């Protein structure tokens, strides 16, 4: 949890323009959040990048979790190993609003963060899931009560979020 270079947006939400893979390798936080789908198939976006950084160890562990427990629900989560990125990975499923999943479930998705005192995380449902990233930051701020360090890869997006929030 040796985070550096973050801007404090609220009492408990911090933001940095950084690649979450590189933040995780440098900080080795207690918890790194993955933006997952219900079958934990880490094919693209943040999920593909975190899985690639574990050289597919996260995918093999995830397939075993699904074979024993079944898929997650939208708005749900599970805690698995963080491998070389963190002590734990919290795999959280935000709604895929491009496939008709209700945006109201974005609040349920962020509620999972409250089970952990400190987390390194991306914006949920942004990117391939289709939600507006600034709306996702708003739900994060309105919902998460624990300390969250958000890593935003795209500089244009990061600047938009900081200008809209400060
Ligand atoms: O922060 C961002 O710019 C977006 C917002 C939601 C998903 C974020 C993200 C971060 C790292 C990624 N690395 C490889 C591929 N896609 C990624 C996507």
Curated annotation (Swiss-Prot):
Reactions catalysed according to its record: Thiol-dependent hydrolysis of ester, thioester, amide, peptide and isopeptide bonds formed by the C-terminal Gly of ubiquitin (a 76-residue protein attached to proteins as an intracellular targeting signal)
Subcellular location: Host endoplasmic reticulum membrane
Regulation of catalytic or functional activity: Inhibited in vitro by GRL-0617.
Residues annotated as domain Macro: 1-166
Membrane topology classification: Multi-pass membrane protein
Known role: Responsible for the cleavages located at the N-terminus of the replicase polyprotein. Participates together with nsp4 in the assembly of virally-induced cytoplasmic double-membrane vesicles necessary for viral replication. Antagonizes innate immune induction of type I interferon by blocking the phosphorylation, dimerization and subsequent nuclear translocation of host IRF3. Also prevents host NF-kappa-B signaling. In addition, PL-PRO possesses a deubiquitinating/deISGylating activity and processes both 'Lys-48'- and 'Lys-63'-linked polyubiquitin chains from cellular substrates.
Quaternary state and interactors: May form homohexamers. Interacts with N protein.
Protein name: Papain-like protease nsp3
Species this chain originates from: Severe acute respiratory syndrome coronavirus 2
Coverage span on the entire protein: 1026 to 1191 of 7096
């Amino acid at each position: 949890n040796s985070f550096s270079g973050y801007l404090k947006l609220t009492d408990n939400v911090y933001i940095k323009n950084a690649d979450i893979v590189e933040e995780a390798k440098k900080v080795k936080p207690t918890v790194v959040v993955n933006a997952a789908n219900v079958y934990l198939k880490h094919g693209g976006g943040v999920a593909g990048a975190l899985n690639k950084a574990t050289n597919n160890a996260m995918q093999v562990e995830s397939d075993d979790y699904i074979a024993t427990n079944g898929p997650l629900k939208v708005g749900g989560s599970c805690v698995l190993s963080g491998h070389n990125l963190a002590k734990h990975c919290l795999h959280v499923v935000g709604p895929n609003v491009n496939k008709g999943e209700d945006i109201q479930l974005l609040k349920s998705a962020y509620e999972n963060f409250n089970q952990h005192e400190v987390l390194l995380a991306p914006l949920l449902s942004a990117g391939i899931f289709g939600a507006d990233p600034i709306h996702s930051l708003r739900v994060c701020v309105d919902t998460v009560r624990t300390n969250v360090y958000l890593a935003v890869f795209d500089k244009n997006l990061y600047d938009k979020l900081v200008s809209s929030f400060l």
